[PDB]
Design a binder for these strands. Structure first.
Ligand code: MG
Ligand code: MG
Length: 758
DNA sequence: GGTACGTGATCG
DNA sequence: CGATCACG
């Protein structure tokens, strides 16, 4: 007796928390309320007698004192050992951060546990509730906005000039200037356009609102303009406004009762691109071109009133492709949510490490296993500093016909068979153990470890799904089950990396090294078997390898490689599996996770080399693209070296246009809060002194001028740069922009920074 | 309702 | 050098 859980949160009523579970039941929105769930933490005491002193600990919050409501002695498992801890109950979840350190402080408290779990996620776990279960069909709406922007303006100065939305009914634009198009709704003002978006969202009542970077652009901007205009945005199903949440240094927006699905973090994790522009992303997924209308063109069309039909078509397409992309990427996010038992909102905005931790926390509750704590700043830094033990340095030069092989589906099987877990590492009075090669870590065989045990169930569940897929005549369940087995593969293949994740609860350096040591025996086997087949291995890392058959035909390399994977998988026991990732026409390798390739369709794929960001000048970005194109598209490293020598000489002779020398960097604080004054801050302070309203979010465009001292004293605001009066710093653009951009790439061919000038 | 991550440039 | 700051 349940529908599909889409989210969960809590509200406070008479100072007491009420859990809200948002559900979709046979097409209808339902909200369930729970007033009975209580927040709690665990305390490990030196002796049971101490509970009388410990239960009397107090804190303060909201003018009122905070108390431990009730105490309960519980028997749990910690570090693969029985443990007795006290469950300390509180009235409100905001009581936990107020009292937890007062409890930890106590002389009779050995340690505290499970004290930083958000209340609604604590509820989902403890109540055994899993989001996104069932065949419930959700509704979707893509939303986008276009704003009037001028160089280096304060966030929200310019009005919103268009709002676009799309669904299965089509893509529409709301604007407040006359545009004669079938999909354009013309209203009287920015205020009436924002009120129309509110009306469209309330009427369509979508379960999912899809945006492209709506967390940082569309919704913060809508909220800023709504504030300036004195209007509300009752977008929540409870009529609440979209809520900005601070995630890192960037934002995350939640719309209560709905799933705000921002594609930007999703696409950034899923696919590898030098830029994540909507146009680049759409082309990568659907193989279709999308036209861009730049901010300066939008401003010119709006202010002049000429060429506005072009701007409205761009706004309409932004919503249309946002809808198509959302429908493409949501199914996998929905199955990952269900698998880890947390809402899509949170899961779509998480790293795989955090997905593993949410899976582990729920599994720990189900297995009565006390969860280890997250490290403190000291421990987190020490983990970042730790050195692991075990591949080779890449082959130099430009290689043709490159085959890509993936090793990742090897590691879950190694964790399971060798019982690699923090609870099985170096156990006292162990009867039988596995010793890791080289590294020598001992893993107890006496009981299955917490992680190996879960992994085995994950892998068995995936095999059952795959078996149901072969035996199914229904194409609808085959589709759903395919996303489910893919979600398990993604989660299982994230465990190896998680053991080494410095913020992990079940962090285990020895576990990660041991998996690396056992894994290496299979990587050495793959390498040897490839090499006896005539293959040259050009690059090897724990993730995979790149190989070619020097001087062979491309179809021969493919055929032999495909035959090779088929053969190795037949020799490797169990679920240990090698995967043929792909083929590349050309490629070069600099170091670990620093390489560049080109496929047979002419698409360039790189890792850890490209500088397509606003804080790098166009001259450096343009030169680097030209160097990569000379190498990968022309197969000519001599051309790439000549490109760099020409650009640097042209910079020396002041032959490069100043527009290609601009650096852009955002102001993120009040100017007095800066500890180190970088060039953009030095420029910003001068603007503020002139009367400019400098605020966090303002992007500073500057050019570095010739002179003595650090660059900060020699940087000028772009609007103040006069080509007649000012002279840019050619040495800075050569040595700090152009050469660093290309020196890593060209190192793969034997050139040093010094070889790239006349 | 806890506030990302890895990585590289520049300051102090 | 270590610290500080920004990108996407
Ligand atoms: Mg747009
Ligand atoms: Mg939430």
């Amino acid at each position: 007796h349940a529908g599909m859980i889409i989210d969960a949160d809590y509200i406070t009523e008479d100072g007491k928390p009420i859990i809200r579970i948002f559900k979709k039941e046979k097409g209808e929105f339902k909200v369930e309320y729970d007033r009975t769930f209580r927040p709690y933490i665990y305390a490990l005491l030196k002796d049971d007698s101490a509970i009388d002193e410990v239960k009397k600990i107090t804190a303060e919050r909201h003018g009122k004192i905070v108390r431990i409501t009730e105490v309960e002695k519980v028997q749990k498992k910690f570090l693969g050992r029985p443990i007795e801890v006290w469950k300390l109950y509180l009235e409100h979840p905001q009581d936990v951060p107020a009292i937890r350190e007062k409890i930890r402080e106590h002389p009779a408290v050995v340690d505290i546990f499970e004290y930083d779990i958000p209340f609604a996620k604590r509820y989902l776990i403890d109540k055994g509730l899993t989001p996104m279960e069932g065949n419930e069909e959700l509704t979707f709406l893509a939303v986008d906005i276009e704003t009037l922007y001028h160089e280096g303006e304060e966030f929200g100065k310019g009005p919103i000039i268009m709002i676009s939305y799309a669904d299965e009914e089509g893509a529409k634009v709301i604007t407040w200037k006359s545009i004669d198009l079938p999909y354009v709704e013309v209203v009287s003002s920015e205020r009436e356009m924002i009120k129309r978006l509110v009306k469209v969202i309330r009427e369509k009542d979508p379960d999912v609102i899809i945006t492209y970077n709506g967390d940082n652009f569309a919704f913060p901007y809508l909220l800023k303009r709504a504030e300036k205009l004195g209007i509300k945005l009752p977008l929540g199903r409870d009529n609440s406004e979209p809520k900005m949440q601070r995630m890192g240094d960037s934002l995350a927006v939640e719309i209560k009762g709905r799933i705000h699905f921002d594609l930007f973090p999703v696409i950034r994790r899923t696919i590898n691109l030098p830029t994540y522009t909507l146009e680049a992303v759409y082309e990568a997924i659907f193989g279709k071109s999308k036209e861009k209308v730049y901010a300066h063109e939008i401003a010119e069309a709006w202010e002049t009133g000429k060429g506005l039909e072009r701007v409205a078509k761009y706004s309409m397409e932004d919503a249309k492709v946002t809808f198509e992309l959302g429908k493409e990427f949501f199914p996998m996010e929905a199955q990952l949510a269900r698998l880890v038992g947390q809402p899509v909102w949170d899961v779509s905005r998480s790293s795989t490490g955090n997905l593993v931790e949410w899976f582990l926390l729920r599994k720990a509750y189900e297995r009565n296993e006390l969860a280890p704590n997250k490290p403190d700043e000291r421990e987190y830094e020490r983990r970042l500093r730790e050195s692991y033990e075990g591949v080779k340095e890449p082959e130099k030069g430009l290689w043709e016909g490159i085959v890509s092989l993936d090793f990742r589906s090897l590691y879950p099987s190694i964790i399971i068979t060798h019982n690699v877990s923090p609870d099985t590492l170096n156990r006292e009075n162990c009867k039988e153990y596995d010793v890791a090669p080289q590294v020598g870590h001992r893993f107890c065989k006496d009981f299955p470890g917490f992680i190996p045990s879960l992994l085995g169930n994950l892998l068995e569940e995936r095999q059952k799904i795959k078996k149901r897929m072969k035996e199914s005549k229904d194409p609808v369940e085959k589709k759903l089950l395919d996303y489910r087995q893919r979600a398990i593969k993604i989660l299982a293949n994230s465990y190896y990396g998680y053991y080494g994740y410095a913020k992990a609860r079940w962090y285990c350096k020895e576990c990660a090294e041991s998996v690396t040591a056992w894994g290496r025996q299979y990587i050495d086997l793959v390498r040897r078997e490839l090499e006896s087949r005539g293959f040259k291995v050009l690059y090897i890392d724990t993730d995979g390898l790149y190989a070619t058959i020097p001087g062979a035909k491309h179809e021969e390399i493919k055929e032999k490689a495909l035959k090779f994977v088929e053969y190795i998988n037949s020799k490797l026991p169990g679920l240990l599996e090698l995967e043929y990732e792909g083929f590349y026409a050309r490629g070069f390798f600099v170091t670990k996770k620093k390489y560049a390739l080109i496929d047979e369709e002419g698409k360039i794929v790189t890792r850890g080399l490209e500088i397509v960001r606003r804080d790098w000048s166009e001259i450096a970005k343009e030169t680097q693209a030209k160097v990569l194109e000379a190498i990968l598209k022309h197969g000519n490293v001599d051309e790439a070296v000549k490109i760099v020598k020409e650009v640097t000489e042209k910079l020396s002779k002041y032959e490069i246009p100043p527009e290609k020398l601009v650096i852009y960097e955002q102001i993120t604080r009040p100017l007095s809060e800066y500890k180190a004054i970088g060039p953009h801050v030095a420029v910003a302070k001068r603007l503020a002194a002139k009367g400019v309203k400098v605020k966090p979010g303002m992007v500073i465009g500057y050019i570095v001028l010739r002179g003595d001292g650090p660059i900060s004293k020699r940087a000028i605001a772009i609007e103040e740069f006069d080509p007649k009066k000012h002279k840019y710093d050619a040495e800075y653009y050569i040595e700090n922009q152009v050469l660093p951009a290309v020196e890593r790439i060209l190192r793969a061919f034997g050139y040093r920074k010094e070889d790239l000038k006349y």
